[PDB]
Design a protein around this ligand. Structure first.
Ligand SMILES: *[C@@H]1O[C@H](CO)[C@@H](O[C@@H]2O[C@H](CO)[C@@H](O[C@@H]3O[C@H](CO[C@H]4O[C@H](CO)[C@@H](O)[C@H](O[C@H]5O[C@H](CO)[C@@H](O)[C@H](O)[C@@H]5O)[C@@H]4O)[C@@H](O)[C@H](O[C@H]4O[C@H](CO)[C@@H](O)[C@H](O)[C@@H]4O)[C@@H]3O)[C@H](O)[C@H]2NC(C)=O)[C@H](O)[C@H]1NC(C)=O
Ligand SMILES: *[C@@H]1O[C@H](CO)[C@@H](O[C@@H]2O[C@H](CO)[C@@H](O[C@@H]3O[C@H](CO[C@H]4O[C@H](CO)[C@@H](O)[C@H](O[C@H]5O[C@H](CO)[C@@H](O)[C@H](O)[C@@H]5O)[C@@H]4O)[C@@H](O)[C@H](O[C@H]4O[C@H](CO)[C@@H](O)[C@H](O)[C@@H]4O)[C@@H]3O)[C@H](O)[C@H]2NC(C)=O)[C@H](O)[C@H]1NC(C)=O
Ligand SMILES: *[C@@H]1O[C@H](CO)[C@@H](O[C@@H]2O[C@H](CO)[C@@H](O[C@@H]3O[C@H](CO[C@H]4O[C@H](CO)[C@@H](O)[C@H](O[C@H]5O[C@H](CO)[C@@H](O)[C@H](O)[C@@H]5O)[C@@H]4O)[C@@H](O)[C@H](O[C@H]4O[C@H](CO)[C@@H](O)[C@H](O)[C@@H]4O)[C@@H]3O)[C@H](O)[C@H]2NC(C)=O)[C@H](O)[C@H]1NC(C)=O
Ligand SMILES: *[C@@H]1O[C@H](CO)[C@@H](O[C@@H]2O[C@H](CO)[C@@H](O)[C@H](O)[C@H]2NC(C)=O)[C@H](O)[C@H]1NC(C)=O
Ligand SMILES: *[C@@H]1O[C@H](CO)[C@@H](O[C@@H]2O[C@H](CO)[C@@H](O)[C@H](O)[C@H]2NC(C)=O)[C@H](O)[C@H]1NC(C)=O
Ligand SMILES: *[C@@H]1O[C@H](CO)[C@@H](O[C@@H]2O[C@H](CO)[C@@H](O)[C@H](O)[C@H]2NC(C)=O)[C@H](O)[C@H]1NC(C)=O
Ligand SMILES: *[C@@H]1O[C@H](CO)[C@@H](O)[C@H](O)[C@H]1NC(C)=O
Ligand SMILES: *[C@@H]1O[C@H](CO)[C@@H](O)[C@H](O)[C@H]1NC(C)=O
Ligand SMILES: *[C@@H]1O[C@H](CO)[C@@H](O)[C@H](O)[C@H]1NC(C)=O
Ligand SMILES: *[C@@H]1O[C@H](CO)[C@@H](O)[C@H](O)[C@H]1NC(C)=O
Ligand SMILES: *[C@@H]1O[C@H](CO)[C@@H](O)[C@H](O)[C@H]1NC(C)=O
Ligand SMILES: *[C@@H]1O[C@H](CO)[C@@H](O)[C@H](O)[C@H]1NC(C)=O
Lengths: 136, 262, 136, 262, 136, 262
């Protein structure tokens, strides 16, 4: 399933606001007593429709909402933050939550560098450990 | 809850039954919750068209969900509605719930309505966006935007999208009154001052409301009495359906509480 | 430790209620304004004592409660949801939270498909790369 | 907190020090929190026997834990208790805390008690089950069930247990009064109407309380006065200890506030 | 980056309090009705500056606070518990959140026991599967 | 948020860009949040020096973070401050927020101040430590300690640090009054009884405040009148800057509300 925008319009430029968690503020900004007030904790940016992301996103958000709204009904948590962390767990679980059969369709293990460094161990012992008939 | 991922230079919904190892989630910072405003899909942003998408309902409890980054909005709303008999219609903003941080025009509606219900929901399944919290309901006197939340995984080529890397933030409250709020039969007036209301129509844009504010003020049509002056505009100014991101008044008025014209 | 029911009785049929998080409701149900009210968000089912699960479960829940109650004392979170997600993390951590020594007692890596596809590489080079003495 | 897993066709507590790779947790949906009612272990479900398992205590703060799925209950309780001097004994249900969703009979107790304590706990270490929340304490006027929570990992053969894949939900409030609530010396009366109370004993089952309601009503023994009629039943109806899931009255009464007999 | 204490003083003995989550209380302690009251749920211990841990810790906590305080500004969660669990996820994600290339700089896979048990398979077939020229 | 790890027999901040597989996190129990008191870095613990590090501010909302284990404290504070016109200055402790569990001396300050602000923050970027919760602000009448939180990963050699493996906990409230609280121009008096205040200076240690309590009591200098006696001490007792973990009065007084000397 790919995403096709079926909205009346798509505003293809996304002006956004968010919050910097940086760790590296001017020198005292970070102390809350001296800190910016609620209204100016924000950073801003502008992202264009390169690769069609903004139109994609608007439609995705639309699409999402039922699936979300239903999930929200189901929980008695008043304000739900866990969602993302919870996704990231399922992410690891879906790859690592069970024996990983090397070279299976569903294993993330890449043994290519290994097997090179085992074919290079045998080519060694065809030149000396096979050199049993030719002595001195 | 479906998750955006970028494959083949295009965003798609990722499907669980066969997600694949090329995909790479190296940290939590790669996941984002993003709040897109409904304007950007080109719903009508005017006060009577907006209000038509909201209703009162009871027996559904409210739920709140956090998102990390929001769209700069053009249009927001701030409702203080009483029932006819002085009673509060909208519940107080719970602790931690702030008005949407970036609005160009805040449509501050005061008035009265039947309010046949405990809470006020979005009829189309959308959310009221506040400060990094989305709620299913409207809180009293707290600025919000209509919109929707998406979740995605950024590739670590683009992990800093939204997060890291400014001609300034400008706001303007627009006062209104209204009666019959939430029914099909509602009257809205736009406030210029205490007693100088203007009768309100759909097609009137904020810019033009501000120039109308600038015309009644400027040209002295503000009621000098201590009765309610209720102006009206001639249906003789035209626009012929142009969204706000895509891309001025010489009339006067005649007198007739004091239900005049222009 | 297995679980033995030491209750006065065990009602061996479990009628249950829960909530569907589905994502696929009739078409408008999912919108909360039109949605079922608090009292009818539920689904129901019935599970029998096949493999002794219901009697098992009742006793398990009993057994659990001390261990839980104690945990609840210890946290100043008023309403504790994290419990499950937290279990699932320890689950991954206990298998993946440290170098996985292939073929160790505590590694989930199955290299059987690999090693077949390395014994099949040598049987190849006993028929041609060893064919150095027989020419033309 | 111990975790159920199914090994060798039987549920067992899984042990951390040597969990083993055959085990497979592919998603969070494989973990479940399940709330089993105490009835199902065959504790007495009658109001005076139930109440004996609860006490007031102070200096222990309340804690709430979420579970995902509950047992349909036969017996629930809904307490509104005042101290003798009109004061509230049980704290109001905090925001989000709903009565248990599936009860056959809700024992609605009103009355007064000494209530020597801030909060009301379960003496045996059990929980009060509300709507997908377990609490350590009783909230005023909010339906609950006694029970216990377990956590398990389903195998993905059975991942849909509880989650996915109906002759209907039928409920009946049963009013009572009581004095001396929470001591060893407490009096309970079962309400038929305003002034028609019946003196209460342990052995009386809900079904029979409903037929007694159907007999006093039907056969006209409801006090015609405007004084409290306090009926009583003869100790001449027998049952000889049968749990409710395993698998009718012809008497009359003689008169004597108005502490009669039957 | 190592940690150097630049405080006026460092009290090099840490008396501490915390809570036992044990699971194994005297026999009724665990029931909250009979339980210790809020003031006595605690255990205590004493840790000395062995390996310089206490001075280390005091400075670390100091150092931490800006980075934390900033993070707290950024969230609208009133009381933030997720922090630790969230760290533990990033921990797994940073090692397992992407194909693990055996023997790469950033793979936690130790194949040493494997490759021994593949060099011991070839030394077998130099003594019999190479024994094709010498018959009977 | 930086994370402690033990490498080469020394604690260091671990760096994300190249954490390495020898490191081993086997469970969540290996991560700890630890709350260190500011005393232990040797800030002045006296009431007027402590108070100088706090201020009122508005438009910053409060945030709370949980930690798992705290230092036994020598000095804590418990503020109940009113504005001059009887109004409450500090917000009530929210539900779940308890005073710091281990304090030797609780400096209970009552008084009045200008309080030019919604909430009271720590000026140096530190936290108010309560019971397993750190907050950015002071709550009314709730014991706290100043300090800071660190996070670490224990190696599983040492996983039981803090967690698992006692000559007893002894506490003493010390009452004070103050005027002008939170400015540079504030007056503190130390309470012995209702009307027997002692004028307060920086250099006075708790021990010596307790012996001064033991001297005025013992030697009968408690005001026998029903006016406020305001004692003072001679500047003739010396100490010459010794922290509290490192390692007794024969004078009398002369009389002069009743602003005496000693
Ligand atoms: C995700 O994105 C989709 C697409 O935009 C949103 O789809 C909208 O869903 C809501 C339902 O919740 C629709 O509201 C209803 O609309 C009909 C008629 O709408 C007319 O006017 C619109 C305004 O300009 C216009 O867009 C419509 O044009 C399309 O639809 C018609 C078919 O109706 C089609 O013929 C056209 O060619 C267009 O494709 C249309 O002309 C209205 O009659 C409904 O009212 C009745 O039903 C409701 C109950 O829902 C009831 O309360 C009323 O009183 C009344 O009985 C209803 O209001 C809206 O039209 C849809 N928009 C589009 C473009 O399809 C969806 O909401 C988004 N989801 C979220 C969560 O935001
Ligand atoms: C998990 O599952 C177990 C098993 O069901 C539960 O065990 C119960 O624990 C509570 C303690 O918290 C017990 O309450 C006490 O019971 C005794 C006597 O009880 C008698 O009556 C019972 C009702 O029919 C009956 O089941 C008992 O039968 C068994 O026990 C006796 C030994 O007592 C034995 O001889 C029998 O052969 C049976 O095996 C018994 O005849 C009662 O005296 C206690 O009261 C005193 O102590 C309390 C303090 O706890 C105090 O408050 C009182 O005022 C008084 O001083 C106490 O009420 C209960 O008997 C146990 N049930 C069983 C079957 O053992 C446990 O609660 C479950 N946990 C949870 C969290 O649900
Ligand atoms: C982490 O650990 C560090 C180190 O301890 C803490 O550093 C402290 O930061 C605060 C700023 O938030 C400082 O407060 C200011 O201090 C100056 C002068 O302080 C003097 O008196 C101190 C008390 O004994 C003393 O320690 C100082 O000694 C050092 O500093 C000077 C330079 O000032 C140097 O010359 C010395 O040789 C020492 O190295 C010093 O003599 C004071 O003037 C400031 O007040 C002004 O500014 C504030 C705004 O911040 C304003 O509100 C005031 O009204 C005024 O205008 C200010 O109070 C403190 O000195 C620092 N301590 C040290 C030892 O450096 C840091 O707080 C810790 N972080 C946390 C989160 O705990
Ligand atoms: C309507 O317009 C007038 C002015 O054109 C506004 O009143 C001005 O408000 C500004 C900002 O506070 C002042 O600096 C000016 O002195 C005012 N000018 C006059 C001519 O009164 C008024 O605030 C506007 N009203 C609305 C609803 O936007
Ligand atoms: C006791 O029984 C009577 C009837 O047998 C109940 O009163 C009936 O209540 C129902 C439901 O509201 C009505 O439809 C009937 O008209 C009533 N019948 C009579 C004969 O009054 C009464 O509600 C029952 N009380 C309790 C406590 O269960
Ligand atoms: C000041 O000291 C006196 C006693 O030296 C304290 O009053 C004593 O308080 C204790 C504990 O409640 C009692 O057992 C004694 O009987 C009291 N003795 C006398 C001589 O009154 C007083 O509480 C102390 N005040 C402060 C502020 O610490
Ligand atoms: C192959 O593995 C061995 C381990 O015995 C290692 O020392 C050697 O450097 C590797 N070869 C190459 C080319 O990296
Ligand atoms: C309305 O009048 C009041 C005083 O009567 C004044 O304070 C207020 O500013 C006026 N409001 C507007 C919008 O003109
Ligand atoms: C074994 O590995 C090689 C990689 O060089 C692969 O192309 C080949 O198909 C594998 N053999 C079988 C039988 O799958
Ligand atoms: C009791 O009487 C009141 C009016 O006095 C009536 O409203 C109520 O329904 C009666 N309750 C019962 C249980 O009969
Ligand atoms: C090597 O692997 C084989 C699997 O075919 C196993 O049975 C054998 O015991 C292993 N050798 C040793 C020495 O452990
Ligand atoms: C102050 O006097 C009141 C009664 O007037 C008394 O109850 C209280 O204990 C006294 N407080 C002190 C600290 O002496």
């Amino acid at each position: 399933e790919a995403i096709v925008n079926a909205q009346p319009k798509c505003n293809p430029n996304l002006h956004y606001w968010t919050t910097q968690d940086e760790g590296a503020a001017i020198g005292l900004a970070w102390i809350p007593y001296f800190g910016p007030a609620a209204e100016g904790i924000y950073i801003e940016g502008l992202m264009h429709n390169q690769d069609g992301l903004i139109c994609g996103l608007r439609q995705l958000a639309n699409e999402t909402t039922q699936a979300l709204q239903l999930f929200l009904r189901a929980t008695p948590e008043l304000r739900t933050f866990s969602i993302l962390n919870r996704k990231a767990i399922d992410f690891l679980l879906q790859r690592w939550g069970g024996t990983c059969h090397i070279l299976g369709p569903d294993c993330c293990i890449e043994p290519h560098d290994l097997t090179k460094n085992i074919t290079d161990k045998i080519d060694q012992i065809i030149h000396d450990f096979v050199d049993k008939t030719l002595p001195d | 809850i479906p998750l955006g991922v970028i494959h083949n230079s295009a965003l798609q919904v990722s499907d669980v039954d066969k997600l694949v190892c090329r995909d790479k989630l190296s940290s939590t910072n790669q996941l984002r919750s993003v709040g897109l405003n409904l304007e950007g899909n080109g719903v009508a942003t005017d006060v009577p068209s907006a209000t038509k998408r909201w209703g009162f309902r009871s027996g559904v409890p409210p739920k709140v969900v956090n998102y990390e980054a929001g769209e700069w909005a053009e249009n927001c709303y701030n409702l203080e509605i009483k029932k006819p008999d002085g009673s509060e219609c909208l519940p107080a903003a719970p602790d931690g719930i702030r008005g949407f941080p970036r609005c160009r025009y805040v449509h501050k509606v005061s008035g009265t309505g039947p309010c046949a219900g405990d809470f006020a929901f979005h009829k189309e399944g959308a959310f009221f966006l506040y400060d990094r919290l989305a709620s299913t309901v409207i809180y009293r006197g707290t600025t919000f935007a209509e919109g929707v939340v998406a979740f995605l995984i950024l590739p670590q080529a683009k992990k800093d999208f939204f997060s890291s890397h400014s001609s300034g933030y400008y706001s303007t409250t627009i006062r209104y009154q209204a009666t019959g709020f939430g029914t099909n039969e509602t009257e809205y007036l736009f406030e210029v001052d205490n007693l100088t209301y203007v009768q309100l129509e759909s097609r009137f844009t904020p810019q033009f409301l501000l120039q109308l504010n600038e015309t009644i003020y400027t040209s002295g049509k503000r009621s000098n009495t201590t009765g309610k002056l209720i102006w009206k505009v001639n249906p003789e100014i035209d626009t012929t359906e142009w969204a706000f991101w895509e891309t001025r008044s010489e009339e006067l008025s005649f007198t007739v509480x004091x239900x005049x014209x222009x």
